[PDB]
Amino acid sequence: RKMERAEGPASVLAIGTAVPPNVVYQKDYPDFYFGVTNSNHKTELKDKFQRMCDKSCVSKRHLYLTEEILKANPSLCAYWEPSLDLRQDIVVVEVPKLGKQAASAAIKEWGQPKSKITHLIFCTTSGVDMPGADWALAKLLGLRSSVKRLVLYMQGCYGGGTVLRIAKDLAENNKGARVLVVCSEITAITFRGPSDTHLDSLVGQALFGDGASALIVGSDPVPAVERAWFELHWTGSDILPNSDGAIDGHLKEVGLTFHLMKDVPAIISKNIGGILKDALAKVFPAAAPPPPTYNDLFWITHPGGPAILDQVEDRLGLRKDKLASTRAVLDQFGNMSSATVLFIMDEMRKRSVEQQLGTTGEGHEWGLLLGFGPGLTCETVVLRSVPLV
Amino acid sequence: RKMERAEGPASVLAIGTAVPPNVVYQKDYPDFYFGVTNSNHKTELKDKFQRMCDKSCVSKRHLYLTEEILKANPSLCAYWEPSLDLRQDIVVVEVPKLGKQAASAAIKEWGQPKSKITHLIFCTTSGVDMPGADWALAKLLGLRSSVKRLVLYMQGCYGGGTVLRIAKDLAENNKGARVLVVCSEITAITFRGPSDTHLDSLVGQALFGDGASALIVGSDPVPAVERAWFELHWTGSDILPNSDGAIDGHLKEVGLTFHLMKDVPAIISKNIGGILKDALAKVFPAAAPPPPTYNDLFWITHPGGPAILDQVEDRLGLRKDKLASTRAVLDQFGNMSSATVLFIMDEMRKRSVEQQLGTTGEGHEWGLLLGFGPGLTCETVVLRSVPLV
Numbered sequence A, B: 001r002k003m004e005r006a007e008g009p010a011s012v013l014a015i016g017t018a019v020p021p022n023v024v025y026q027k028d029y030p031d032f033y034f035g036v037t038n039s040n041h042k043t044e045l046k047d048k049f050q051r052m053c054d055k056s057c058v059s060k061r062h063l064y065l066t067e068e069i070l071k072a073n074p075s076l077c078a079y080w081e082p083s084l085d086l087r088q089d090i091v092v093v094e095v096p097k098l099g100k101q102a103a104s105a106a107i108k109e110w111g112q113p114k115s116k117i118t119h120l121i122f123c124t125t126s127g128v129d130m131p132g133a134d135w136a137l138a139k140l141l142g143l144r145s146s147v148k149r150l151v152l153y154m155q156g157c158y159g160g161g162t163v164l165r166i167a168k169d170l171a172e173n174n175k176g177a178r179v180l181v182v183c184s185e186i187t188a189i190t191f192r193g194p195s196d197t198h199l200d201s202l203v204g205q206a207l208f209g210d211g212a213s214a215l216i217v218g219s220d221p222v223p224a225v226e227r228a229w230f231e232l233h234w235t236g237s238d239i240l241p242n243s244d245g246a247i248d249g250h251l252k253e254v255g256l257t258f259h260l261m262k263d264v265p266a267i268i269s270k271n272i273g274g275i276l277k278d279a280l281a282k283v284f285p286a287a288a289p290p291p292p293t294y295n296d297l298f299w300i301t302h303p304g305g306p307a308i309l310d311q312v313e314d315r316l317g318l319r320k321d322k323l324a325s326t327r328a329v330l331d332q333f334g335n336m337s338s339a340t341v342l343f344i345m346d347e348m349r350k351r352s353v354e355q356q357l358g359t360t361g362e363g364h365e366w367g368l369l370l371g372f373g374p375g376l377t378c379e380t381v382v383l384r385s386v387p388l389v
């Protein structure tokens, strides 16, 4: 008359990632972007975009859109031309497909048959449809027809925190539940030509890349059969003060548009300390061990842009190595919206194993995953690593 | 280092509903719809639409769109004209607003200050935005800035089951959690002129109406302070066999479009028995009382259309009164997509109280809530009523 619940903390049992094969190196992107968009005559706009690329701390990105595809579809290279139907036709197909590559890698690592997946969460900011990308992914994988699905559309850059916040309750409240979590982002929904009109969209052109990540999340891993890599222990969500309209995105007839105030780094950096201090106080209450210091935590931080990272690091006084895993993903992949923190989680555990650190969190026991996006919404997850060998 | 979980079953503690004030009676709708759309010359198409309205078992609907608004915005009255940006500007505002009316009613009934709401789920098929309708509703209500939000976009007619499936885990896995659940639907996103092109969209014009419903869901109601009306005990989700493309909806430059095969009733009716029999077997396992008979359950059934209800009733052999609560909502409000089953839940408990039946479920202990939509997805929730006086 009842659904048995699980006992232990929701745990990450496997991670997979996937990116489009086409690589664009940042040194080449100003020429490329202004070339295929027919805007090289816009001489001062391009110098402005060159400075954004020079400062982006992005070396390369993987992009579904190629010069050939852009040549085939000139309404994408144009500026403010109607093109949503064209964008949707692309991403309603390619977002689940990219997600399927990451999902198959995570399942292969996990090692159990795909029919043990009981739940699915699909998160994307690229396109919407009915049935949704969750249904399409289930069809592509051949998941059981009774998988409990959830599609999280139009989330944006905090979505990596959101999927963990939901997956935690699904795994913990359902005995045996194994949650496939996929975030998949493809910039074909936003890509548009340059214009002194909208210097916000330029920022997006310098930073956003494509990618998908997949997790298996479940409570009570079977001993010597499944392997936990991180545990979810505490979650919080906050709308930061005086941030109305900081980050807005609209799905228009010209596609997805992006609006971004210059004070996003300030708003984030100046509020994040109180959020983290409160979260750590709840996880480590006095009544008892004190919370670890920031430098004794591992850090999985959504790299909205280098200015956000630099100002957060400065305001919290983080030692300069704490954001190294985060900054490596931004350098090699750019900002992949909701998927990015799961790429960072993967990079951190793999570094930790390769370098024989004592835990999956670079040697630290406790850790923080942060997502930031429209709201301005800050998603906080307190994680525990797992000891290695 | 941990979030305490709750103990008892997730319970519905209050329900509110809201509809646009403009009423259109079905007897008037063929003339009205073909009038404001400039299509009265389409003589045989209209006779076809008259027969759909005659058969709809819908007496009236509440619609945000008025003749005055349609006169002001002729691209809505047209057929296949670009109009998404216009539709979004409407529903990104009006869907949260309608939802706020229902939410305030549910909170007023519940009786606790609005700051005790810890979580929010907003479900809609009408428009998408960043930040989302969940953020807008929180702003309209003045909810705490740390409310844990979730926006479920592009769900469709199964969404009433989905929100209960998620809210169950949120309430049960978080001690003290009180989940505001809102479904809000406004047909301005789909409304378009008639055409022998697309006889699917005609079906939608005869059945779909507007409305919003709101729940407070929480585990462990405080005795003599909060009041439970229904308990969530079991949830299931199924993709019905040989239903690929049964019900599709796309968000296009002309707005939201709707595609619907004629065999939806057949697919639903011919598969539903096995789903319910399995669900009841899980809730009442042999090893022990047998499951109640269908006629001894209460029924909260999404009324996709009268043909779905009639064929489900026939195939399962339901006594003719079991779907009376469901059919009363369809008659007085039409199909309000994801909100409809919560209107039906409200109607049933209010009937039960008014008629002094022994339980909130028309006198029956156990009950079934069913949502159907794109997939073809069937959402099943097994509910327990609460005894009255």
Ligand SMILES: CC(C)(COP(=O)(O)OP(=O)(O)OC[C@H]1O[C@@H](n2cnc3c(N)ncnc32)[C@H](O)[C@@H]1OP(=O)(O)O)[C@@H](O)C(=O)NCCC(=O)NCCS
Binding pocket: A048, A051, A052, A055, A056, A157, A199, A200, A203, A247, A260, A261, A262, A264, A265, A303, A304, A305, A306, A307, A308
């Ligand atoms: C890469 C930028 C992107 C980093 O460069 P920087 O350290 O700011 O260096 P600069 O200030 O020289 O930036 C160069 C140009 O970017 C422009 N710029 C920066 N942020 C901008 C914004 N939000 N909108 C428009 N222009 C912006 C500056 O105005 C400047 O123009 P100018 O050289 O003609 O004066 C940085 O501001 C950043 O990281 N911002 C975070 C972006 C963000 O908010 N992302 C989160 C997500 S949606």
Ligand SMILES: CC(C)(COP(=O)(O)OP(=O)(O)OC[C@H]1O[C@@H](n2cnc3c(N)ncnc32)[C@H](O)[C@@H]1OP(=O)(O)O)[C@@H](O)C(=O)NCCC(=O)NCCS
Binding pocket: B048, B051, B052, B055, B056, B157, B199, B200, B203, B247, B260, B261, B262, B264, B265, B303, B304, B305, B306, B307, B308
């Ligand atoms: C109201 C209809 C809507 C009920 O009427 P009915 O009992 O079918 O009566 P009829 O078959 O005389 O219907 C009249 C017309 O509707 C048309 N019709 C019914 N379903 C249709 C569909 N999916 N697409 C196009 N036309 C349809 C019939 O072709 C018929 O046309 P005709 O009179 O010119 O031959 C009914 O088929 C129904 O309830 N369907 C369920 C709709 C549905 O699937 N909703 C769930 C959600 S998205």
Ligand SMILES: O=C1C[C@@H](c2ccc(O)c(O)c2)Oc2cc(O)cc(O)c21
Binding pocket: A125, A126, A155, A156, A157, A158, A185, A186, A187, A188, A189, A190, A208, A209, A210, A211, A247, A248, A249, A250, A256, A257, A258, A259, A335, A336, A337, A372, A373, A374, B130
């Ligand atoms: O406007 C967007 C773009 C979006 C996005 C889509 C696809 C990608 O591959 C990608 O890297 C990004 O991500 C966003 C995230 C936000 O928080 C706000 C936005 O406007 C957007």
Ligand SMILES: O=C1C[C@@H](c2ccc(O)c(O)c2)Oc2cc(O)cc(O)c21
Binding pocket: A130, B125, B126, B155, B156, B157, B158, B185, B186, B187, B188, B189, B190, B208, B209, B210, B211, B247, B248, B249, B250, B256, B257, B258, B259, B335, B336, B337, B372, B373, B374
């Ligand atoms: O195409 C739609 C329309 C949608 C809807 C929106 C707003 C309303 O007020 C309303 O009653 C309905 O509901 C749908 C539900 C589905 O399952 C499929 C759809 O295509 C649609």
